[model samples]
Target: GSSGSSGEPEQVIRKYTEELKVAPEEDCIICMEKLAVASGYSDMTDSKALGPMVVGRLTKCSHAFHLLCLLAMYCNGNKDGSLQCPSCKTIYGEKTGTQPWGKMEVFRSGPSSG
Candidate 1:
């Protein structure tokens, strides 16, 4: 279960597989790539190694974004186990990081059985 952080990535990536043609003018705010295309990322070769670009329509916001785009934002110090809507700042879950103290707190509650 410790590798649990990776689950969010799987969910986020599945956000792909949507064929969009509604907003040709619209682009993913993450990669700034065309949302209407299969690859939701910049054409630059450096950005080539990324995943598929499927529009992820959030359950609440209905704000569609390339799953790849969302992944970019999601990985930005956002390893807190919560997925966020990039535009309106809608947070889906709690940021479960930085609060559970480990190395420094284990010596006290602290190892009381000693």
Candidate 2:
């Protein structure tokens, strides 16, 4: 369905995301590994990349995460169609879940007669 009122994924990314540069020896907290292609974290598809292994910076929290790692997190989560900063708990969108469609019924019973 629609990704909340954000309009589109690209629009949300543009408004709330930025590039994160990690030193060669630096590590990503999400995956607990060096931010390198060898560790399977790269933004090779990014047109602005000087090289591979670029991470993402969240505008709200100023925290960084491996792009691939973040995608994995988004996918494996409860499908709320939203994202939260892993470090600071900053929310990105209206969080919603894919709970099953159903209805609930409530009933009250009268006191039993002795």
Candidate 3:
């Protein structure tokens, strides 16, 4: 089914970028954007149906992060199945995951995407 012709909401894709955004620092850990002044926390301690793990929040955006933080979580430890985005709940095929580029945040003096 189609999600219609309207463009996807900006709030729905804040985590898509790799550069670490720093704003409203107190409320968000990944520091997506403007966070709510309300006091609450994200519940990443469990798994939800249709996804291996589920993380939810009770604030402005209430953004979610799956077991692997992104769609690369699957095939990571599984000898089976596909990858899925825990936030938008989008499923991915095995051909979708990335190569292991562990622990290195920034690349050396190359053409930066940021």
Candidate 4:
């Protein structure tokens, strides 16, 4: 196994504390007790996959959600690689999940080592 495949993307979860963040406003549109709390949508939607209290500010959609919420949404859609704002139904133009790109390593030394 290599260091990969949580579905969302490497940079997706790794940027929470980085400078690119725009702390969410208007409570997680997917679920809300508070951004500090995991989604309540799990209780109602039977989402047992309940996401953590992480924020995902939409790039072009003007909305925010639990980073985990967006992840769940992607999985829900069969990992088709699209991110839609749960609040507004707005979507990212790129359906990136279409890239089924995990090939077995060729070089033994460092294909996936970091």
Whole-model Cα lDDT per candidate?
Answer: 0.51, 0.50, 0.31, 0.48
Best by lDDT: 1
Arranged by TM-score with the best first, the candidates are 1, 2, 4, 3
How many clashes (backbone atoms < 3 Å, residues ≥3 apart in a chain or on different chains) does model 1 have?
1
TM-score of each: 0.52, 0.50, 0.20, 0.50
Error of 4 at 102 (Å): 32
lDDT of 1 by residue, 27-82 (tens): 56655567776654334222343445445566655566766665565564565555
Model 4 Cα lDDT, one tens digit per residue, 5-55: 444432442332221254554576455457766666454344333346445
Residue pairs in clash, model 1: 16-54
Pairs that collide, model 4: none
**Relative to the unseen true structure, what is the Cα RMSD of model 2?**
13.1
Tell me, by TM-score, which candidate is best. 1
lDDT of 4 at 102: 42
**How big is the positional error of residue 55 in model 3, measured in Å on the Cα after superposition?**
15
Range of the 10 consecutive residues with the lowest summed lDDT in candidate 2: 95-104
Residues 2-112 of candidate 3 have per-residue lDDT tens digits of: 764533222222333222232123222332323433212223313232222223332222343332233233322422344334333333334334522432254652212
RMSD of each: 11.9, 13.1, 14.5, 12.9
TM-score of 4: 0.50
